[PDB]
Design a protein around this ligand. Sequence first.
Ligand code: HEM
Ligand SMILES: CC[C@H]1OC(=O)[C@H](C)[C@@H](O)[C@@H](C)C[C@@H](C)C(=O)/C=C\[C@H]1C
Length: 394
Amino acid sequence: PVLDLGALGQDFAADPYPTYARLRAEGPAHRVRTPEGDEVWLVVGYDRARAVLADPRFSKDWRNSTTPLTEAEAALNHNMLESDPPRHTRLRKLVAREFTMRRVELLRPRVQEIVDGLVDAMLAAPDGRADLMESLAWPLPITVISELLGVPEPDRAAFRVWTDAFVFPDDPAQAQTAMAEMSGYLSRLIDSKRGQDGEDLLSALVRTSDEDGSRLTSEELLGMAFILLVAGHETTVNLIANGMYALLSHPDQLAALRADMTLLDGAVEEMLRYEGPVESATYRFPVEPVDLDGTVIPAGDTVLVVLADAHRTPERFPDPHRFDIRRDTAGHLAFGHGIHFCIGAPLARLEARIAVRALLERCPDLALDVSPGELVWYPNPMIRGLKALPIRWR
Ligand code: HEM
Ligand SMILES: CC[C@H]1OC(=O)[C@H](C)[C@@H](O)[C@@H](C)C[C@@H](C)C(=O)/C=C\[C@H]1C
């Protein structure tokens, strides 16, 4: 049959794991209907999830999908995440040097400065209370990526409204309108760099496209700006929020980290394992019928690798539902796996590490200012994210 995910309401959005685990008991692949009405395949179970993410039979090029693209969707589609080799290879090579650990490490002073200023403003609240999402989780990643790419400050607010419509639109037409608006804005921003001799990443990309259109077409120039600004926004925002929620709702772990801040890196890894922002990977399309344990997924269908269920597979992560900052987290799929492994992983880790350390060191008696049952989780099947994260201190 086809399991209806939308018929489970906020209960599934808040705690989807028993649903996924139930399906994994029956097999690796399952036809479901998303809360928004999309008929898709779910791939569950760690070993299968990891294998499918790197299986070249599961393409990311939309030319291999039987799902139609709107005009707005197609305009942003020429990007590395929605490509196979050789196009994926050519596109990622253009910006790979920008995101290595060595290069990202040169951003640590600026990231620390951004975090310091945002925490300063948060601590200015007289009642010692704040929404962590608004105070730190949203502004930090959009500030970093905007300075790297060259998005002027007055333009960034509208950018966050758009990506919000991508995840939780009030209706499907609102997602379409935001896509057309972001496409129009990005093309204008690309135009504004032309001939201005800027040294931001977008300025270099415009130059690259202009002097050889076969190395980076104008559609791919637009798609590159788009994917670099969008792919890391909702993810990094929700890693900080989900991770802080994990720390604040497991007080034993918060105390362990407070008493030994060298556990920080291992704690961020477990935040990725336990409550990573990517619940399911982006769309994959079998180039041919693929047999998964007697379940055959036909060519062109939409396949979602449920990363969240892979991280709760007991054979791979023993005692899966325990948030343990000292856990062996090696092999988690929070950044994906294969040729599409997150290009921004060093940057995301840098932002998350600095953000967590700042809160723990500068918010005395930091605590969750609402009950976990009162939190509201967004129902998007790809993103695990909170509506807000009320906190208190002092
Ligand atoms: C906590 C933060 C992040 C998480 C959990 C995350 C997660 C992921 C995942 C799971 C994928 C692969 C998706 C798929 O296979 O379906 C991916 C790819 C990608 N991510 Fe991230 N990401 C994060 C941060 C960032 C940041 C900050 C940037 C911006 C520079 C970024 C840029 C990208 C790009 C461009 C790709 C596509 C790479 C390619 O296809 O080779 N990510 N990310
Ligand atoms: C790092 C990959 C991201 O997904 C995207 O960037 C897809 C391509 C995009 O449609 C974005 C806009 C899809 C929406 C639902 C989003 O914010 C989700 C997810 C991340 C997993």
